[PDB]
Amino acid sequence: EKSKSSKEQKKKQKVIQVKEIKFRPGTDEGDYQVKLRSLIRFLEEGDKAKITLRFRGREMAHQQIGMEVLNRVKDDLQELAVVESFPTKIEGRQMIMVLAPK
Amino acid sequence: IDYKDIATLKNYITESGKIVPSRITGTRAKYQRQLARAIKRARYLSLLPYTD
Amino acid sequence: PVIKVRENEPFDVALRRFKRSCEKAGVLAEVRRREFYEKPTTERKRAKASAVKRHAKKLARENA
Amino acid sequence: RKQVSDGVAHIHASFNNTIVTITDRQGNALGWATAGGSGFRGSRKSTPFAAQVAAERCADAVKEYGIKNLEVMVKGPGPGRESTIRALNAAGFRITNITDVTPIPHXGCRPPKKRRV
Amino acid sequence: SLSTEATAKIVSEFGRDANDTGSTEVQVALLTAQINHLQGHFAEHKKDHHSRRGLLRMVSQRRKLLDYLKRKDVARYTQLIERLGLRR
Amino acid sequence: RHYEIVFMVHPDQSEQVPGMIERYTAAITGAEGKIHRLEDWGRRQLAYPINKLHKAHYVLMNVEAPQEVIDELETTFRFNDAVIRSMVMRTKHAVTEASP
RNA sequence: UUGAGUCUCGUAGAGGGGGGUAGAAUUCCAGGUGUAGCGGUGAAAUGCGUAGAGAUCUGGAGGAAUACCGGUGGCGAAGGCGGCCCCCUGGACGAAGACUGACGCUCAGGUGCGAAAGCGUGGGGAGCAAACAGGAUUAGAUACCCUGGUAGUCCACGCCGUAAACGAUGUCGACUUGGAGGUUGUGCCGGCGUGGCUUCCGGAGCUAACGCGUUAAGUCGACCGCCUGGGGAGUACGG
Ligand SMILES: NC(=O)OC[C@@H](O)C[C@H](NC(=O)[C@H]1NCCC[C@H]1O)C(=O)N[C@@H](Cc1c[nH]cn1)C(=O)N[C@H](C(=O)O)[C@H](O)c1c[nH]c(Cl)n1
Ligand SMILES: [K+]
Ligand SMILES: [K+]
Ligand SMILES: [K+]
Ligand SMILES: [K+]
Ligand SMILES: [Mg+2]
Ligand SMILES: [Mg+2]
Ligand SMILES: [Mg+2]
Ligand SMILES: [Mg+2]
Ligand SMILES: [Mg+2]
Ligand SMILES: [Mg+2]
Ligand SMILES: [Mg+2]
Ligand SMILES: [Mg+2]
Ligand SMILES: [Mg+2]
Ligand SMILES: [Mg+2]
Ligand SMILES: [Mg+2]
Ligand SMILES: [Mg+2]
């Protein structure tokens, strides 16, 4: 039945998707700011953000460079975000902090 | 060519009422132009049909 | 394409006549060309390439 | 109810869907059935078979009016042009005139832009 | 264009004969007649740029013929422009 | 300057056509009218409906006249609510010979 | 009088401006019939529909554009120009003459015309659709795809003055083997000629080559425009 319509109105409840910005150990200020902007938006518009850093070949040997990038994001997106997850180990070659709308 | 000459004009229209190419009918270009004018004048007066 | 089934005709024969009436009249080709907008430069370009192809086939029919 | 001797089968055969509608001779709706309402969904609707089924269900809707003659009025470039009328004749209507409507502008309005795919 | 009667009048008036259609007087008289006639056309039809190109050709042809007549014979020139009412 | 005037009259008003054909020719022959041809074609079957009418009373006239009087005649056809359609044409020469 | 013009007669043409009008189609409105879907995609969803849609039929309203004909067909200086009819109007071409008597060619500066977008003012607004809104897709998707949709697209008047505004080929004149077509005149007796415009091929010649090739990019003459390594830059500054 047009019953359906009920759902259409029900479906005017809402929904959060997680959006994935991948950073790399040495991304530069310009692109950081672009991706940072993307996240601000993502978050302010009610969404989560799986922020991934993706070491490639030998870069996996200076994981501590990576962690500093994540820590910079956390510290910029501070008043907008709370940090569901942080990583410590480097499973695979990744570090997959998940931020959520404060 | 004459717009009133429905008999001749009907040889150069299809069943739907569309003008036939000169490549098909073998008409000369000059007369094909007169033919097309005649048919459109006949269509206006409702002597020939546009469609169907 | 108006096809009255004549005095005592089968359907399969009558359907062949109807489909052929549409094929000659040019209805499916006409609807498909009018589906999306073609700007005059594209129309003219298409018409030129056809004319080149048609004519070039005659020069391939000739010299052979 | 009324009985109708001769009917008209309007076949709105779009690219995505087929609508079969049996009317009176004056275009009063008696019954209708679509490929979308025939347990076909999405691009399943846009097959000849889904139109065939839609024809059959349309025939079943207008059994009560007691129609034996139908005039066909097919419209559009849809995949289910011929499959409808074949299936209509299989229902046991005597098909008289078989006829292509299909609105063609004599120029008319500017069409939508080409899909870049 | 001018009518055949309008042309035939001018040829008789400004020519040495009815046969004499070639003379600069006739030519300028013909051009003047049409130039003056078309002033009404382009008054109404301001946007008719394609026709106006034809008018400018008449004016340009008249000018060139008058300039030729001036250096050929000033007496004929002076008579002609006063008859037709041309400034120059 | 040599015209050809077809006009189609409402088929119920075929009886008015006598009086109208007089008026038009009388106006044309007023000012050097040369009625080369005049053919009452009669109530013919229309190839398509005009105003829910499947018939109309056709008339043909090939006339030479002033270019003002024809424009003045065209004004009357507009006002004539009976007459449904008309094509005034320009012919180069007079047509005396009969049409089918 | 051979260049350049004028006149006589005729021919073809979407050449231009104005007015009227026809049929088809989309949308919308009002009804009738009818009943649960419609629409859309790669797949979906947004969207629309029981306040009755889509479909079908009747009538009405309004705007924009003119299927077929339609053609390496035509016309125009170029830009461009396509229903039919009338009015006003520009050019081209052919046939014979008659007429003028070098009146010519080119043209810095100048003047005008000049697709589309755009701008100003006032109208109009069906369809389409930058922006935008929502739905998707994706690593992201400020896109391509879907549903909507504003400017605009249309008209008047004024402005803008640019486009791969291209034949990427300035204009005018003369000369120099051929072949096959198209379109439009015309003479003579379908044939035999002879003019205009135009498509394709190709000879000499030319060209870096590609190619061009009597519509030259060949052989010459007149006049104009323009170039002088790439980027910086068609930018800065000034007018
Ligand atoms: N999004 C991103 O970052 O990456 C994804 C992108 O690479 C997907 C890829 N997309 C395409 O080729 C585009 N072609 C133009 C139309 C739109 C779209 O289709 C693609 O695979 N398409 C598929 C359909 C699809 C989209 N997402 C998952 N599947 C497809 O069928 N593409 C067709 C093709 O590749 O030929 C075609 O382009 C098409 C038909 N219909 C549509 Cl929509 N696209
Ligand atoms: K009237
Ligand atoms: K000069
Ligand atoms: K709009
Ligand atoms: K070579
Ligand atoms: Mg042109
Ligand atoms: Mg152009
Ligand atoms: Mg010059
Ligand atoms: Mg514009
Ligand atoms: Mg404005
Ligand atoms: Mg749209
Ligand atoms: Mg869109
Ligand atoms: Mg430029
Ligand atoms: Mg250039
Ligand atoms: Mg060549
Ligand atoms: Mg060279
Ligand atoms: Mg600049």
Helix locations, F1-100, DSSP H: 17-30, 67-79
C-alpha pair distances (Å), B30 with each of B25, B41, C23, C36, F16: 14, 17, 29, 34, 41
Which nucleotide minimizes the distance between its C1' and the CA of B50? Answer: G23
Q: How far is C39 from chain B (nearest CA, A)?
A: 24
Which residues are within 8 A (CB) of F10 and not within 5 positions of it... i.e. 6 or more apart? F53, F56, F57, F82, F83, F84
Report yes or no: A77 and A99 within 8 Å, Cβ to Cβ: yes
Q: E45 CA to G116 C1', in Å?
A: 25
Which DSSP letter does residue F3 get?
Answer: E
- Edge-to-edge order in the sheet of strand A81-85: A18-19, A48-50, A98-101, A81-85
Nearest Cα residue to D5 out of D60, D62, D47, D56: D62
What gap in Å lies between CA D24 and CA D5, rounded to an integer? 9
Of B2, B6, B44, the CB nearest to F87: B44
Report yes or no: A97 and A73 within 8 Å, Cβ to Cβ: yes
End-to-end CA distance of chain B: 24
User: How many domains, chain B?
Assistant: 1
Here the tokens at position E77 are 């020139």
Residue corresponding to tokens 């005039």: D71
Nearest Cα residue to A49 out of A88, A15, A17: A17
Q: How many degrees, rounded to 5, is the angle at CA B42 between CA F32 and CA C4?
A: 155
Residues of B in contact with F8 (CB under 8 A): 45-46
Task: For F35-56, give one letter per residue: b (16+ CB within 10 A) or e.
Answer: ebeeeebeeeebbeebeeeebb
What gap in Å lies between CA D72 and CA D89, rounded to an integer? 10
3-state secondary structure of E75: helix
Here the tokens at position E54 are 């034809």
CA-based nearest residue in chain B for residue F87: B45
- Edge-to-edge order in the sheet of strand C2-3: C2-3, D94-100, D69-75, D6-13, D18-23, D29-34
What gap in Å lies between CA F50 and CA F52, rounded to an integer? 6
3-state secondary structure of A65: helix
C-alpha E77, offset from chain centre: 13
Chain E residues 49-68 within 7 Å (CB) of strand G: 49-51, 53-55, 57-58, 61, 64-65, 68
- Give the CB-side neighbour count of residue D44, counting CA atoms within 13 A: 11
Which residues are within 8 A (CB) of B13 and not within 5 positions of it... i.e. 6 or more apart? B19, B20, B39, B48
- DSSP states of D51-116 as a string? HHHHHHHHHHHTTTTT--EEEEEEESS-S-SHHHHHHHHHHT-EEEEEEE--------PPPPPPP-
| Farthest-apart Cα atoms in chain A, separation | 61
Nearest Cα residue to D54 out of D23, D33, D24: D33
What gap in Å lies between CA A47 and CA A19, rounded to an integer? 7
Report yes or no: D20 and D48 within 8 Å, Cβ to Cβ: no
What gap in Å lies between CA E27 and CA C5, rounded to an integer? 74
Give the Cβ contact number of residue D79 at 10 Å: 21
Q: How many degrees, rounded to 5, is the angle at CA F84 between CA F82 and CA B19?
A: 160
What gap in Å lies between CA D69 and CA D23, rounded to an integer? 12
- DSSP states of B1-52 as a string? --SS-HHHHGGGB-SSS-BPPHHHH---HHHHHHHHHHHHHHHHHTSS-S--
3-state secondary structure of A100: strand
How determined?
A: cryo-EM
Q: How many degrees, rounded to 5, is the angle at CA B40 between CA B39 and CA B46?
A: 85
What gap in Å lies between CA A22 and CA A97, rounded to an integer? 11
Report yes or no: B47 and B4 within 8 Å, Cβ to Cβ: yes
* Residue B52, domain extent: 1-52
Task: For chain C, give the number of residues.
Answer: 64
Tell me phi and psi for residue C30, to 5 degrees: -75, -40
Task: For chain F, give the number of residues.
Answer: 100
Q: Say what angle helices E4-14 and E24-44 make with each other, to 10 degrees.
A: 140
What gap in Å lies between CA B22 and CA B33, rounded to an integer? 10
**Interface of chain D against chain C, CB under 8 Å?**
76-77, 82, 85-86, 89, 95-100, 102, 104-105, 110-115
Tell me phi and psi for residue D33, to 5 degrees: -160, 140
Q: Say what angle helices C11-25 and D82-91 make with each other, to 10 degrees.
A: 160
C-alpha E80, offset from chain centre: 11
- Give the CB-side neighbour count of residue F49, counting CA atoms within 13 A: 3
Q: How far is B48 from chain F (nearest CA, A)?
A: 5
What gap in Å lies between CA B52 and CA C21, rounded to an integer? 12
Helix locations, chain A, DSSP H: 3-10, 29-44, 63-76
Of F85, F99, F100, the CB nearest to B45: F85
Nearest Cα residue to E14 out of E3, E4, E23: E23
What gap in Å lies between CA A37 and CA F60, rounded to an integer? 80
Which DSSP letter does residue E4 get?
Answer: H
Which DSSP letter does residue F46 get?
Answer: P
Q: How far is D91 from chain C (nearest CA, A)?
A: 13
Which residues are within 8 A (CB) of D6 and not within 5 positions of it... i.e. 6 or more apart? D25, D67, D68, D69, D70, D71, D96
Q: Which chains touch B (3 or more CB pairs under 8 A)?
A: C, F
Sign of the alpha-carbon dihedral angle for A73, A75, A77, A81: positive
Here the tokens at position D64 are 């009560």
Here the tokens at position D51 are 């139109």
Q: How many degrees, rounded to 5, is the angle at CA E66 between CA E65 and CA E69?
A: 90
Here the tokens at position B46 are 């409702």
In sequence order, what are the beta bridge partners of D74? D11, D100
What gap in Å lies between CA C9 and CA C15, rounded to an integer? 10
- Secondary structure tally for chain C: helices H, strands E: 3, 1
Chain A residues 26-85 within 7 Å (CB) of strand G: 34, 37-38
Which residues are within 8 A (CB) of D22 and not within 5 positions of it... i.e. 6 or more apart? D7, D8, D9, D10, D29, D30, D31, D32, D58, D59, D61, D62, D67, D70
- Strands (E) across chain F are located at 3-9, 34-45, 55-64, 83-90
Give the Cβ contact number of residue D15 at 10 Å: 12
What gap in Å lies between CA D25 and CA F80, rounded to an integer? 37
What gap in Å lies between CA D51 and CA D9, rounded to an integer? 13
What gap in Å lies between CA F58 and CA D96, rounded to an integer? 35
Q: Say what angle helices A63-76 and A29-44 make with each other, to 10 degrees.
A: 50
Q: How many degrees, rounded to 5, is the angle at CA F64 between CA F60 and CA F68?
A: 105
Of B5, B7, B48, the CB nearest to F47: B48
Nearest Cα residue to D96 out of D58, D66, D67, D54: D67
Nearest Cα residue to D81 out of E36, C18, B18: C18
In the chain, the amino acid numbered C37 is: Y
Tell me phi and psi for residue C59, to 5 degrees: -80, -15
C-alpha pair distances (Å), F5 with each of A69, B38, F57: 89, 15, 14
Element (H, E) at E66: helix E49-72
Q: What is the 3-state secondary structure (H, E, C) of E7-45?
A: HHHHHHHHCCCCCCCCCHHHHHHHHHHHHHHHHHHHHHC
